[PDB]
Design a binder for this molecule. Structure first.
Ligand SMILES: Cc1cc(/C=C/C#N)cc(C)c1Oc1nc(NC2CCN(Cc3ccc(S(C)(=O)=O)cc3)CC2)nc2ncccc12
Ligand SMILES: [Mg+2]
Lengths: 414, 556
C-alpha cells in the first residue's frame, strides 16, 4: 500500500484541540514502550511545536490478556472528520448479524497500520504522552498510517479488507461478517466446535494476507439475547400498597401502550386505608388487570429505527449488582430493553459494573444497528470521569451524559 | 573553526487566510532614532537581524524606551499585530510541576542559556513577516529596514520554539544520563543529581561539552543566588518547600479587590497551610464587578479571616516526594460545605495540603461532598505523583456501605480506611423500603392558586386524623412539601406517607441532609427525629382514595 487517500475535515472546522487527561505512572510507562516500537516501525513520528492539535490517549488491557494496548480517544476528531462514502454510497448494516447463533469479535485494528495516511491529514492525529507532574515535556507524536479508533480507518481500508475476506466469504456463503471500527464481527449459525476453528481459519487468512491482539476472540450469542417486557405482579392478596404501586406502573405504561385503564383498580382504593391492608380484588378490577396484562404482551406499535437519529441508552442501578437499560430514539418507543446481573469482578464496585454495562450495551447496539448509543449514566460526572478508563476494555468509546435527578421510572423496570 | 550542528528550524505559518502585519511606523525623536540605529547595528553584526530592500511590504512598529538608572535606551518591537496573525503553537510550558511531586536532589546547578537563545534560527520563509523600519533623521532618507533571523523577543512563537529546540538538543544527554534531571525555566537550565559534588560537576562539564556541539556557550548563572529558589510563587529549599511568605493585610475598609487578593492568597496558601477556609470571605463577592466597591464584613468572615491568621502565624513547609514510600490522603469536614485535606508519606510530614468547597446547589449531603473531595484529590494526586493515595476518611465503613448499596446512582471511593476524627460523616435518616405495619398512613396533598398565590396543604389518615392549613404566597411545589412536613409533625415515630408529588419525591430520593430551602430543612429535621418513614408515591387525579379526598380538601 503506497497510494494515500485524500481526507479532509468538515467545512469550517479546525482539527481537535483536546486536553490530555492525567495518566498513572504505569499507563505512561506502557505507552512509552508501545510508542517507541511504533516509532521504530514507522507508524508514528515525533512532531514539533508548530502542531497545536491534540487528542487524548491512554492504555487498556483487553479482556483476559497481558499486554497493554494503546487506545486513542478520537471522538472529537471522528466528529470533525468528513463523512465518508469511500468507494460506495454506504454499506447496508447487516440485519442478519443479530440473528446468528454465535458471533465472534476480532480486533483487526493492526491491519490499518499497513496503509499510509494522507500526509496533509497527519497533523490532526497529534497526541501527547504526558509526564508525571509536568516534570519533563510531553512526548508529541502524529500518525503516518491509518490509526486505530479513527472513523476513516475502516472506511479507507474497506477496499483492502473486502478482498482479503473474498475467498473466505465465497467459501462460506452463510457466514455473516460485519466491520465496525477496529472490530470484525463474524457470525455463524453452526455450533461451537466449528466456530473457533472457522474463526481461526479467518485469523490465518489475515496473517497470510498480512498482530498483537489478533489471536483473541470475543464470543457472543445474540440469538439468546433476552428482552425485558413489562410485567405486572400476580398475587393472591393485594395490599393497598401493592395496588398503589400497580396503578403507578400501569399509569406509566399507558404512555407507551394504548388502552391501559386503571379505573376499576383505582376504585379499590376508596377511602383512606392503611397501606398494609389487604383489599380483595373485584372481578371488574380483575378483568381490567387481565386486559392490561394482555396489552402489555404485544409489542409497542409504531416503533421503527431511524438511521438519521441518534440511539439513546438509559441505565438504572437496581441494586445487588443488577442493572436495567432501554435503547430508544424517541421517548416511550423502546427499540430494545434489557437487564444485567452478576457483573464479574465488581461485586463491591458500582463504577466498574456500570462501565461493563456500558460496554455490553454498546456491543449490542453495534450488532443490531451498526452504531453506538449516547448514554444517560446514573452517576455524577466527576465520579464517572475519574474512574471509567480503569475498567475500559473496548477499542471504541461511545458518548455519554449524566443523570443527576433520580428517575421515578427505576421502580417500573424492577 | 570547529563545525557546529545547525539547530533544526521549526516551520511557521500565519493563521489561514490572514496575511502578515502592515502597521505604520510612528514618528520618533532624533535622539530615539540615533539610539535605535546603534542598537540595531550591533544586533545586525550579531546575526540577529538583517537589512532588507524596499520590496518587503510588511511592517511592525519599533519604539525606544528609557530606563531609570541605566541611562541607556532600549528598543521595543511591538509584535502585537504579528502575534494576532501568527498560527497557534503547542505551548509545552502550560503545566508547572507542583513542588510536592519533586524529588530531593543532593546537588543542583544553574546554567544561563539566554545566549543559546539567539542560536535558534527563525524559519526563513517566515522572516519577511518580522520587518520593521527605523525612521530616518528628519525623514530625508529612506528608513532603514530590517527583519529578524532569530526568534524575536515578544513574538508569539518564541517561548514554544525555543523550549522545543532546547528539549530536542538535550534529549540524548538526558536519556543517556538517567542519574540526573534537567529542567528549563525561561533563560536558565537547572541540573540536579544525587551524585557527590565532584561527580556532579563532571556531569555539568559533559553537558557543556554536549551543548557546544550546537555552538551553545553556557556559563554558570552569574551571581549564584543561595537557596531557596524563588520560582512560580514557591520557595524551593534543598529539603523542603513552601509558598513564598503569605502576609494578610490589616485593613479597616475591605473592598472587593481586597478580598479577591485575600482569597487568592488563602487559596495559594492552602496548598501547604492546613485548614485554611474561604467560604465566608468568598460569599461576600457574589455579583459585584466594580473593583472599588467596599463591602462590610459579616461577623462570620471576620471569624474565618481571624482563624486564617492563626494558621498563618508560623511558616509551614512540605516535604518532597519519595517514590519508595506510601502515599496517604486524610480528609476532615470543616462545616458549611468546606473540606480540608493533607497528603503525606510519613505522619506529621505533609507533602501538601488542600481544600474542597461544595458545588452550588439547593440540596446536598455530607457523603456526596466527601465523595467529591475524594475524586478531586485522586485526580490531583494522579497529576502530581502518577498514583492514587490511600485515603483516611471520617466515615465509618458501615455508613459508606449502607450509603452506596442503597444510593440510586453508581458511586465509588478508592481504597480507604476510617479515621475517628469528629465530626464524622453520617447518614441522618434512612427511608423504609416497605410500608410499616401498624404505623398510621397519612395521605398528603397541597395546591396553590397560581394567580393569587393562596394555597392549602394538609393530610387525611386511616385513623381519621385530618388537617388543612391555608397558606399565603405559595406555589404548587411548596404546598406539596408543606403537606409532607405537616404529616411528619403530626405523626408518631413511625409513619407511612402517601404523596402524589413527583417534585417532593425527586428531592427526598436525592437524600439531602441540608438545604437552602428552609422548608426542606424542616422536613429533614423531622426525618432525623423519626424511627421509620415509608414514603409512597401515587399518580394524581386517578381516584386513589385518600389522595383524592385530600386533593379536594386542598384545591379550594
Ligand atoms: C531541577 C529543577 C529546578 C527547578 C527550579 C526552579 C527555579 N527557580 C524546578 C524544577 C521543576 C526542577 O526539576 C526537577 N526538580 C526536582 N527536584 C527539585 C527539588 C527541590 N530542589 C531545591 C534545591 C536543592 C538543592 C539546592 S543546593 C544544590 O543545595 O543549592 C538548591 C535547591 C531542586 C530539585 N526533581 C525533578 N525530578 C524529575 C524531573 C525534574 C525535576
Ligand atoms: Mg393534587
Amino acid at each position: 500500500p503506497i497510494e494515500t487517500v485524500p481526507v479532509k475535515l468538515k467545512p469550517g472546522m479546525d482539527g481537535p484541540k483536546v486536553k490530555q487527561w492525567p495518566l498513572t505512572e504505569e499507563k505512561i510507562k506502557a505507552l512509552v514502550e508501545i510508542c517507541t516500537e511504533m516509532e521504530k516501525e514507522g507508524k508514528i513520528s515525533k512532531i514539533g511545536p508548530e502542531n497545536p492539535y491534540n487528542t487524548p490517549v491512554f492504555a487498556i488491557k483487553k479482556k483476559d490478556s497481558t499486554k497493554w494496548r494503546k487506545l486513542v480517544d478520537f471522538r472529537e476528531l471522528n466528529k470533525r472528520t468528513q463523512d465518508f462514502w469511500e468507494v460506495q454510497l454506504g454499506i447496508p448494516h447487516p440485519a442478519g448479524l443479530k440473528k446468528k447463533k454465535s458471533v465472534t469479535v476480532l480486533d483487526v485494528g493492526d491491519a490499518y497500520f499497513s496503509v499510509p495516511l494522507d500526509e496533509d491529514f497527519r497533523k490532526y492525529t497529534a497526541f501527547t504522552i504526558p509526564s508525571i507532574n509536568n516534570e519533563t515535556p510531553g512526548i508529541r507524536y502524529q500518525y503516518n498510517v491509518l490509526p486505530q479508533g479513527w472513523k476513516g480507518s475502516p472506511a479507507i481500508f474497506q477496499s483492502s479488507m473486502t478482498k482479503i475476506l473474498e475467498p473466505f466469504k465465497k467459501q462460506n456463503p452463510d457466514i455473516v461478517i460485519y466491520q465496525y471500527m477496529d472490530d470484525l464481527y463474524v457470525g455463524s449459525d453452526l455450533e461451537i466446535g466449528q466456530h473457533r476453528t472457522k474463526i481461526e481459519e479467518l485469523r490465518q487468512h489475515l496473517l497470510r494476507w498480512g498482530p498483537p491482539f489478533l489471536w483473541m476472540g470475543y464470543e457472543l450469542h445474540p440469538d439468546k439475547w433476552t428482552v425485558q417486557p413489562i410485567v405486572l405482579p400476580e398475587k393472591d392478596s393485594w395490599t393497598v400498597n401493592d395496588i398503589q404501586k400497580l396503578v403507578g406502573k400501569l399509569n406509566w405504561a399507558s404512555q407507551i401502550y394504548p388502552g391501559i385503564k386503571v379505573r376499576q383498580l383505582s376504585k379499590l382504593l376508596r377511602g383512606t386505608k392503611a397501606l398494609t391492608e389487604v383489599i380483595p380484588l373485584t372481578e371488574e378490577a380483575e378483568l381490567e388487570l387481565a386486559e392490561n396484562r394482555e396489552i402489555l404482551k404485544e409489542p409497542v406499535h409504531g416503533v421503527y429505527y431511524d438511521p438519521s437519529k441518534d440511539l439513546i441508552a438509559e441505565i438504572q442501578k437496581q441494586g445487588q449488582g443488577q442493572w436495567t437499560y432501554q435503547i430508544y430514539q424517541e421517548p416511550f418507543k423502546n427499540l430494545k430493553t434489557g437487564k444485567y446481573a452478576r457483573m464479574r469482578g465488581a461485586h463491591t464496585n458500582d463504577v466498574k459494573q456500570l462501565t461493563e454495562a456500558v460496554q455490553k450495551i454498546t456491543t449490542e447496539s453495534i450488532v443490531i444497528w451498526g452504531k453506538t448509543p449516547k448514554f444517560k449514566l446514573p452517576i455524577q460526572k466527576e465520579t464517572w470521569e475519574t474512574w471509567w478508563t480503569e475498567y475500559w476494555q473496548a477499542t471504541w468509546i461511545p458518548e455519554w451524559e449524566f443523570v443527576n435527578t433520580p428517575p421515578l421510572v427505576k421502580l417500573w423496570y424492577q | 573553526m570547529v563545525p557546529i550542528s545547525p539547530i533544526e528550524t521549526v516551520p511557521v505559518k500565519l493563521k489561514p487566510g490572514m496575511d502578515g502585519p502592515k502597521v505604520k511606523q510612528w514618528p520618533l525623536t532624533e535622539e530615539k532614532i540615533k539610539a535605535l540605529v546603534e542598537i540595531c547595528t550591533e544586533m545586525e553584526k550579531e546575526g540577529k537581524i538583517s537589512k532588507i530592500g524596499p520590496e518587503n511590504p510588511y511592517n511592525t512598529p519599533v519604539f525606544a524606551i528609557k530606563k531609570k538608572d541605566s541611562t541607556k535606551w532600549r528598543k521595543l518591537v511591538d509584535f502585537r499585530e504579528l502575534n494576532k496573525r501568527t498560527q497557534d503553537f503547542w505551548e509545552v510550558q502550560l503545566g508547572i510541576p507542583h513542588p510536592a511531586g519533586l524529588k530531593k536532589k543532593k546537588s543542583v546547578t544553574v546554567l544561563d542559556v539566554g545566549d543559546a537563545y539567539f542560536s535558534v534560527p527563525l524559519d526563513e520563509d517566515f522572516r519577511k513577516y518580522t520587518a520593521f523600519t527605523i525612521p530616518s533623521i528628519n525623514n530625508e532618507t529612506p528608513g532603514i529596514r530590517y527583519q529578524y533571523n532569530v526568534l524575536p523577543q515578544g513574538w508569539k512563537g518564541s517561548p514554544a520554539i525555543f523550549q522545543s529546540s532546547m528539549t530536542k538538543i538535550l534529549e540524548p544527554f538526558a536519556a543517556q544520563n538517567p542519574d540526573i534531571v534537567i529542567y528549563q525555566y525561561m533563560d536558565d537550565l537547572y541540573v540536579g543529581s544525587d551524585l557527590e559534588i565532584g561527580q556532579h560537576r563532571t556531569k555539568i562539564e559533559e553537558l557543556r561539552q554536549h551543548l557546544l556541539r550546537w555552538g551553545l556557550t553556557t556559563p554558570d548563572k552569574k551571581h549564584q543566588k543561595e537557596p531557596p529558589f524563588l520560582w512560580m510563587g514557591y520557595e524551593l529549599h534543598p529539603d523542603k518547600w513552601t509558598v513564598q511568605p503569605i502576609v494578610l493585610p490589616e485593613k479597616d475598609s475591605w473592598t472587593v479587590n481586597d478580598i479577591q487578593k485575600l482569597v487568592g492568597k488563602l487559596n495559594w496558601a492552602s496548598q501547604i497551610y492546613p485548614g485554611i477556609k474561604v467560604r465566608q470571605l468568598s460569599k461576600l463577592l457574589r455579583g459585584t464587578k466594580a473593583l472599588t466597591e467596599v463591602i462590610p464584613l459579616t461577623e462570620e468572615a471576620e471569624l474565618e479571616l481571624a482563624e486564617n491568621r492563626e494558621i498563618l502565624k508560623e511558616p509551614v513547609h512540605g516535604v518532597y516526594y519519595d517514590p519508595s514510600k506510601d502515599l496517604i490522603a486524610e480528609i476532615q469536614k470543616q462545616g458549611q460545605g468546606q473540606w480540608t485535606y493533607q497528603i503525606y508519606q510519613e505522619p506529621f510530614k505533609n507533602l501538601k495540603t488542600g481544600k474542597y468547597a461544595r458545588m452550588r446547589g439547593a440540596h446536598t449531603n455530607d457523603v456526596k461532598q466527601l465523595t467529591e473531595a475524594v475524586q478531586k484529590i485522586t485526580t490531583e494526586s494522579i497529576v502530581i505523583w502518577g498514583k492514587t493515595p490511600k485515603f483516611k476518611l471520617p466515615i465509618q465503613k458501615e455508613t459508606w456501605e449502607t450509603w452506596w448499596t442503597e444510593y440510586w446512582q453508581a458511586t465509588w471511593i478508592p481504597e480507604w480506611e476510617f479515621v475517628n476524627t469528629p465530626p464524622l460523616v453520617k447518614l441522618w435518616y434512612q427511608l423504609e423500603k416497605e410500608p410499616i405495619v401498624g404505623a398510621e398512613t397519612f395521605y398528603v396533598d397541597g395546591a396553590a392558586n397560581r394567580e393569587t398565590k393562596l394555597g392549602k396543604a394538609g393530610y387525611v389518615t386511616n385513623k381519621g386524623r385530618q388537617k388543612v392549613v391555608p397558606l399565603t404566597n405559595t406555589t404548587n411545589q411548596k404546598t406539596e412539601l408543606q403537606a409532607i412536613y405537616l404529616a411528619l409533625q403530626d405523626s408518631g415515630l413511625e409513619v407511612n406517607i402517601v404523596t402524589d408529588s413527583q417534585y417532593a419525591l425527586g428531592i427526598i430520593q436525592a437524600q439531602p441532609d441540608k438545604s437552602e430551602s428552609e422548608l426542606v430543612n424542616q422536613i429533614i429535621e423531622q426525618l432525623i427525629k423519626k424511627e421509620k418513614v415509608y414514603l409512597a408515591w401515587v399518580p394524581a387525579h386517578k381516584g386513589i382514595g385518600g389522595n383524592e379526598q385530600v386533593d379536594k380538601l386542598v384545591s379550594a
